[PDB]
Design a binder for this molecule. Structure first.
Ligand SMILES: Cc1ccccc1S(=O)(=O)N(CCN(Cc1cncn1C)c1ccc(C#N)cc1)CC1CCN(C(=O)OC(C)(C)C)CC1
Ligand SMILES: CC(C)=CCC/C(C)=C/CC/C(C)=C/COP(=O)(O)OP(=O)(O)O
Ligand SMILES: [Zn+2]
Lengths: 339, 447
């Protein structure tokens, strides 16, 4: 073994693996580890038991990571060492970038990154090439959940909601694939996500109010709302069946306290007339417009018509949900009729 | 050309955008791989095909696959080292679903988890790994399934309580381990462990969270979960992240551990946005569920999304008295069943993410869990097995029998395909969850 014969490691004795192949019955789902991994992890057990914060221990974590980057314990212990020894975290980030590029789907790497980057002493401001590296990751997997989650944290930590690269990178990703829902979600955070430093983080404003009003902004910037709705319409016209911008628009209207009927004419434009339908989302939009924000007679029947188109032709797998909505609307109209 | 297969499952959607992007290229390829399987005309499919044109669940093949998955792996599988407790859980769960008696695994389970439990509390991935809520969740559920006093006695409850207390965060959520990430998966796993072991509601007297005004494990928790809802209606892993089916299950299940679904869910979640987002998870012709908007169907979401439905439907229906009308199923049981049975079965045994993927025990476990869900009415009642999480232990089940003819809410599996029912929150058999909870309730908390 490389560790057992290294004088660098002579001062500590490894802790042999206790699998359970001795205590009694045979353990389940065992792995016949390679000799190298067995030795390394036996030395890791020893250094962690002694709470050792050293350069050799740091190198050991790096070696184990090169064999198994899905070892959650080693990442956490590595972070402890880095801080305890006052290591250059700029160098650790440069090393971490290489690991991340080799293991695109590994999420442990990205929590580790957050742990390091959260240190104000080492990273008082946004590093000059941090956003570029995120784009290097997105160029390979544009919907990576862990990278997007890290980017959300990054925006909050360094207060980047109005930073031009955040919106520029979103728009670049949406130019490449307008159906990238991860990019739309980030855009919502940038434009309408809560920013109050004295509050716990939240995806939506007004979580202290009634749940039906979750998302409602305390103060609305009307020009910003108009601009975001116009952006949404423009993207929709590029691909009308794309759910993401329709959902984004619903979110914006909810945030602004505006009714869905503001897009009544827009929604109608995708259902001209036999009916030629260019978007099922337009149908669902009209359904909600006629059902909720319209209190005139005939409106309920129109909503039911839209939902029937959905259940029979344009989104039939969700028939049971469409029928539920029809029953809700029918009961509502009946209650109104009783009055 | 089986006549029992509706056009909905034999054709791509009617509406198609002209614009091609990576998203549509992947979606198209997935649909094209699924279509011959959905039609029941692929050479890899084994019969018999039922009146709905759907192949039988290959019970024997899946049994052998799951049994084999509990044995030794080569050195190349080292990446599973931290996930060994999950490996045990996924296999035991699958075997249970398929109707096996797993009590013979008692001593082997004990041997596995003895070395993985840390003296300072909790269970990690194995000897020398720090405690983690996911491995602890997997371990506790495995112990529940095999049952027995000896397995129950394995857990150091007081140390588990002290360790879990260290994970409680000022914002109400939980980290998954000391120094680890905080996400809703952490909250769900922690609270399941807390409930099944009947741990004290109060935080340990020396818990750090007490400095921030928190007094119990549930203090600030549903508020935290509320802050994980997104503008889409779904629920994300942490505040601000993208809505995802796996996290929606974690959050909804966790809320239903806090009180009656019809009380807690509407209070902390906007159901008006949650419902359509959940509904939109299901695609045709595939029939299965995707995890998030504009991504692909995956058989494991048969559980993560699939089991959101009994929870949401209970929130709408309310608690059932054993001494009322229901909204019914708001998704397509037919679609999900077709996806699982026609598309997710590997001819050599095991179930898979999607056609073109190798099977694994994770996808086998959760596809079967999803298949079981469509076969039962799951509902909560006013009678609990707990002598004091009361609603969480009030869940009961009745069979939803295989159907005949066409309809919007039908069972297109055969009764030969019937699996054991699982608890919607605990993801183990009801009796297993009941037995472990009751046993711990009658044990004094150690000094
Ligand atoms: C545990 C593991 C160990 C090594 C490599 C990957 C993983 S995992 O991706 O996290 N895992 C679990 C399911 N999964 C991936 C997945 C499968 N289907 C949908 N998803 C999200 C998750 C789960 C939790 C989290 C978090 N936080 C992120 C992803 C995937 C299972 C199915 C695929 N697996 C399997 O085929 O085994 C090999 C890869 C070792 C040969 C491993 C188990
Ligand atoms: C009980 C507890 C452990 C629950 C956790 C379940 C598990 C599935 C967590 C969700 C992971 C999420 C980030 C999916 C992204 O992966 P992806 O991009 O590969 O998959 P996707 O394309 O379907 O979103
Ligand atoms: Zn999956």
């Amino acid at each position: 073994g490389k560790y057992s014969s290294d004088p660098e490691w002579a001062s500590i004795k490894p802790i042999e693996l206790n699998d359970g192949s001795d205590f009694g019955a045979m353990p389940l789902a065992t792995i016949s580890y390679s000799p190298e991994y067995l030795e390394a992890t036996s030395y890791l057990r020893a250094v962690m038991a002694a709470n050792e914060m050293s350069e050799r221990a740091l190198r050991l974590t790096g070696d184990i990571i090169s064999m198994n980057p899905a070892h959650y314990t080693v990442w956490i212990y590595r972070a402890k060492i880095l801080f305890a020894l006052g290591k250059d975290l700029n160098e650790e980030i440069e090393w971490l970038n290489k690991v991340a590029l080799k293991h695109l789907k590994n999420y442990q790497i990205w929590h580790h990154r957050q742990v390091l980057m959260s240190s104000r002493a080492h990273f008082p401001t946004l590093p000059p090439r941090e956003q570029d590296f995120l784009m290097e990751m997105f160029a390979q997997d544009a919907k990576s959940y862990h990278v997007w989650t890290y980017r959300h944290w990054l925006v909050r930590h360094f207060k980047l909601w109005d930073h031009p690269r955040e919106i520029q990178d979103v728009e670049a990703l949406l130019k490449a694939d307008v159906r990238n829902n991860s990019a739309w979600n980030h855009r919502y955070m940038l434009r309408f996500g809560p920013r109050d430093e004295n509050e716990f983080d939240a995806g939506l404003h007004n979580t202290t109010g009634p749940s039906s009003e979750k998302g409602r902004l305390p103060v609305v910037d009307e020009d910003l709302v108009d601009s975001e709705l116009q952006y949404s319409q423009s993207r929709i016209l590029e691909a009308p069946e794309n759910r993401s911008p329709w959902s984004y628009a619903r979110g914006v209207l909810q945030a602004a306290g505006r009714p869905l009927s503001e897009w009544k004419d827009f929604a109608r434009s995708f259902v001209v007339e036999d009916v030629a339908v260019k978007s099922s989302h337009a149908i669902e939009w009209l359904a909600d417009v006629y059902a909720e924000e319209d209190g005139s007679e005939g409106s309920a029947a129109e909503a039911v018509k839209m939902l029937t188109l959905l259940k029979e032709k344009y989104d039939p797998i969700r028939r049971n949900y469409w029928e539920y909505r029809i029953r809700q609307i029918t009961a509502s109209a009946a209650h109104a009729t009783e009055i | 050309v089986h006549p029992g297969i509706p056009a909905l499952f034999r054709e791509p959607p009617l509406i198609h955008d002209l614009l091609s992007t990576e998203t549509t290229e992947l979606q198209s390829e997935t649909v094209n791989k699924c279509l011959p399987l959905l039609k029941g005309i692929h050479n890899s499919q084994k019969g018999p095909f039922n009146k709905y044109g759907i192949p039988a669940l290959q019970r024997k093949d899946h049994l052998e696959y799951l049994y084999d998955s509990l044995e030794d792996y080569p050195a190349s599988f080292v990446a599973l080292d931290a996930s060994r407790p999950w490996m045990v859980y996924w296999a035991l769960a699958g075997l249970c679903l398929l109707g096996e008696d797993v009590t013979r695994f008692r001593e082997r389970v004990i041997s596995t988890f003895t070395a993985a439990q840390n003296s300072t509390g909790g269970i990690g991935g194995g000897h020398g790994q720090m405690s983690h809520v996911a491995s602890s969740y997997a371990a506790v559920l495995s112990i529940a399934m095999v049952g027995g006093e000896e397995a129950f006695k394995l857990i150091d409850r007081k140390a588990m309580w002290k360790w879990l207390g260290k994970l409680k965060q000022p914002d109400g959520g939980f980290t998954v381990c000391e120094g680890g990430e905080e996400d809703v998966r952490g909250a769900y796993c922690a609270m399941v462990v807390h409930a099944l072991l009947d741990l004290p509601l109060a935080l340990p007297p020396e818990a750090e969270a007490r400095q921030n005004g928190l007094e119990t494990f549930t203090d600030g928790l549903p508020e935290y979960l509320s802050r994980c809802q997104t503008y889409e209606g779904g629920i994300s892993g942490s505040p601000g992240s993208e809505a995802h089916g796996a996290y929606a299950f974690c959050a909804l299940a966790c809320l239903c551990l806090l009180g009656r679904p019809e009380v807690v869910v509407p209070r902390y979640m906007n159901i008006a946005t949650l419902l359509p987002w959940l509904s939109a998870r299901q695609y045709a012709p595939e029939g299965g569920f995707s995890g998030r908007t504009n991504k692909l169907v995956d058989g494991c979401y048969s559980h993560w999304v699939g089991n959101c439905w009994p929870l949401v439907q209970a929130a709408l229906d309310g608690t059932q008295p054993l001494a009322r009308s229901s909204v019914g199923n708001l998704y397509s049981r037919e679609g999900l069943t077709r996806y699982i049975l026609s598309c997710c079965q590997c001819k050599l045994g095991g179930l898979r993410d999607k056609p073109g993927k190798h099977p694994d025990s994770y996808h086998t476990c959760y596809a079967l869990t999803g298949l079981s869900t469509v076969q039962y009415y799951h509902y909560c009642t006013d009678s609990s097995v707990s002598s004091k999480f009361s609603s969480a232990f009030s869940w009961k089940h009745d069979p939803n029998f295989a159907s005949d003819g066409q309809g919007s809410d039908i069972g297109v599996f055969t009764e030969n395909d019937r699996l054991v029912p699982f608890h919607p929150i605990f993801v183990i058999p009801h009796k297993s969850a009941e037995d472990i909870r009751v046993w711990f309730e009658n044990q004094s908390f150690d000094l």
